[PDB]
Assembly symmetry: D2
Homo-oligomer: 293 residues x 4
């Protein structure tokens, strides 16, 4: 029954140097998001979580640890999608049993699945788990484009709540809000939060909210209250930080900014580069001084 | 001199059945924009004016008729860009002698020009004419993407005013406003006016403003005033109309909507389809009844 | 150190309705390829094997069955790549222990891995197993493009043998053969076999060879012998069959063509469509009559 | 009725420093192609001729000069396509009056014309001139893709002889040859001449033939004779040269290679870079020493 509107951090995961999960570090990341970034929720097992590089057992362990640490303090969404639909169903049942408030699932990728195959994949996860479902749309990684009529076909299933929209088409975004006004949209591009919020999205899911969740909430709330001059000021500073993060290496730089606040956010998981070079550590420290001190 | 902020219709041109310019009809389009749509200005010779399908002599005739009809009641911007730099210089001189308030020029297209070639093109037109210049960026037609640092190089020429930004990258849009706060941005996607206006663009240039200019100004002014809930209601209705216009054939349907108000907006120019089928005439009359009566 | 040149079928896998592997049917597919299609080898665990939709245990089982059935009568290459490098290493070690003649790995996908990350991926699989490696390049699924210099960086590891080139850039193909004449290339687009063979590729790996292996060998051998007129006639017939297969649904139609020859090639694995409609079964029977009877 | 099969240089044009046509230089380029490169024909007014940067009067001047110089010694094809259909008709009339053996036209670009619009553009040019037509397809500059069925619809007009195929899709190329065996295909990618000739194209139109026409003919004739091994050697040397030419700047490097053989090939036309830098001149001399004796 939890309210799923608002600000969700896409949870990063602390890894050890061999790619195993650092449980102590992961708990610190969850606590930091709840207590310091003051998020409304966590989106667990998404792209940001380095999810698609992991085994099924590692994904389950992440779901277990996040929920045990968070308890019922905040809303939790579990991304369980994959090219492997039988894995998605297994993970979806697990996360449902642990009490995740909704599931979410990336459009299946690699192969060029037809729309009917995509709709069957969502319907299958829903039927096996009995849980709510949020479509996770990220066309710049998957190459999958879903149009207005196709969203409506997905929404014929009453357990589909809406879409986590990590997409840059704001005409599509407005058309979704017009066609399906009771369905939810979470914006997925942190550097375009202000314009997405201007179109009445219901929340946002972001990797950078792990370190910049305070400003993110401001942008969102001020935009929806009509305080655009102030919201734009804060989006400008946010995007100076994001531009730095992206140039330096997104996941590693957010983890370095966490480490600089005492959170043991650990290594990245190979095949991503597992650690920053010394010059890039220095650069991350300059970002910390300029934007998060 | 003139203030160049606000609502600019991308001027449609009335053609006869043989592709020649219908002067009476083109004057009627100009008068309708000034007197009924209440635009701040016209952008003449743009994609919307079917410009790239015409001869240099036809382009000159359009510039002459628009300026003669409008006189100084509104601001006028002349788009003079081409793959042919010598033509762009000739049209830029001609429009400047007519008293156009600024020039503008599409990034040169077809050949894959390098950035230094593109910059030389802008500087050459400016030096030859002595007039102001607005960069016209339309990557979805030209395939040219100009980054933040590159716009900065263009803006080293002090006669460059800004960019007519017919592009959907709202991260780039924000970054341009951060880096070059005194340079102007005009939004070019009518269906995304609200989110562009929320990022503080200075104006908008739009084909649909030839018939929907009243709503277009409302969206823009309400957004500027932080009245987002009301602006969004009007963007929604505007986008029902635009969706229908796009589906039925953009330029011909805008022309039909003008003809239904007694403006003799004429044929389209081949190789675009020159007239609407009977069924598409009926569809345009249904749009008129639903959205513009 | 088996000869890896010549004709390899990309092994299809027989599935039951519940998505499990039908072992009897998979053994039949292996036997048909060896005994009737007269392949030089099999490429096991590739895109064609529906590999990316499967669990680690399932991939292991396919490797075990293929090797138990084929023994040492043909060459076997094990595709073990994934977004999960730890799984790739686990499957690489497993296929090495089973006695596969080389490993192969798709470029890691979904995330936008840098080139250094891609090379570290190949090196980590090789150094953890000590086996040979064939780069599997399929830009139209992964969006990864590797240039000539980057191939040379990969080839600095002496256990990299060459590339399974499921790509359409015949300029790149020629430059690779020029730059690395001792390294091997297997053509991956069955419908462009003749032109790839004319540039001196060493072999080909193809899904359609599971049913069209007789013609495929003819095209390859006739081209190498300079008998282009005769090779072209056979490529034209092959491409009539391939055009029909693609239109009807690639994997399901190859499987139906196998079933029509008494091979229990089974269902496809969800989220792919698992079975042909009645109309498409009839269309496949027509292809069988026209091209394979 | 002239035979249009074989080797066609895409004629470069000699410009003065101010962008005007250097007639003396252009005649020398024509004579070099006929007398030294021993071409079958010239393709005049194409991409290579810097055509799309020029005025109608300049395009006419080039057609007049090329014909006056070539007389009846070789075949001549006039590319007259443009976004401006009226201009294309005017040029096609003029080239027809001058005696060009066929017209050719690029698919209309910039705007996103529909297929019925593209077909009408070709039929309009043909029906206003009464001359033959070659479709000029170059998706990498225009973004226009035409499929096999669509070619068939173009070929419904009996004056359409076939297609100048500057495209990399060798499956499409095969399928066109199969579907329309009496219609001609000229390859437009000089660096893929061998694999195109392997599929039975009737000729080739190329920018590099202005300087490498001897090897180009050898690759083409040896491939049609099944002498693949020798053809492939010469394609390798050819592509070493082409790689250097592309790296150094295509149009300017071909012109410099002409100048090094005593042909006054002139400047390029702005907005292309008009002259090679001293360092790039030196690189061109190294290419000359290495590949063009």
């Amino acid at each position: 029954m939890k309210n799923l509107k608002g600000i969700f951090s896409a949870l990063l995961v602390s890894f050890n140097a061999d790619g195993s999960i650092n449980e102590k570090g992961l708990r610190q990341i969850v606590r930091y998001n709840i207590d310091k970034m003051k998020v409304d929720g966590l989106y667990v097992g998404g792209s940001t979580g380095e999810n698609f590089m992991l085994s099924t057992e590692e994904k389950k362990e992440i779901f277990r640890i996040a929920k045990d640490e968070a308890k019922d303090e905040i809303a939790l969404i579990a991304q369980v999608g994959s090219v492997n639909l039988q894995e998605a169903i297994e993970l979806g049942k697990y996360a449902t049993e642990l009490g995740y408030d909704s599931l979410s699932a990336v459009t299946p990728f690699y192969y060029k699945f037809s729309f009917p195959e995509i709709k069957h994949y969502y319907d299958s996860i829903i039927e096996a788990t009995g849980n709510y479902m949020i479509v996770y749309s990220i066309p710049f990684l998957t190459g999958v484009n879903i149009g207005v009529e196709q969203f409506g076909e997905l929404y014929k299933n009453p357990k589909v709540l809406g879409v986590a929209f990590t997409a840059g088409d704001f005409y599509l975004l407005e058309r979704l809000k017009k066609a399906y006004p009771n369905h939810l949209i979470w914006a997925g591009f942190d550097e375009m939060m202000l314009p997405a919020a201007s179109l009445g999205v219901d929340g946002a899911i972001g990797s950078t909210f792990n370190v910049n969740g305070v400003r993110a909430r401001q942008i969102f709330e001020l935009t929806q209250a009509g305080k655009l001059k102030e919201a734009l000021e804060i989006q400008h500073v946010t995007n100076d930080l994001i531009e730095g993060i992206l140039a330096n290496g997104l996941y590693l730089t957010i983890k370095e900014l966490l480490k600089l606040d005492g959170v043991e956010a650990g290594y990245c998981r190979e095949p991503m580069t597992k650690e920053l070079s010394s010059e890039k550590v220095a650069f991350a420290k300059e970002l910390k001084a300029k934007y998060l001190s």
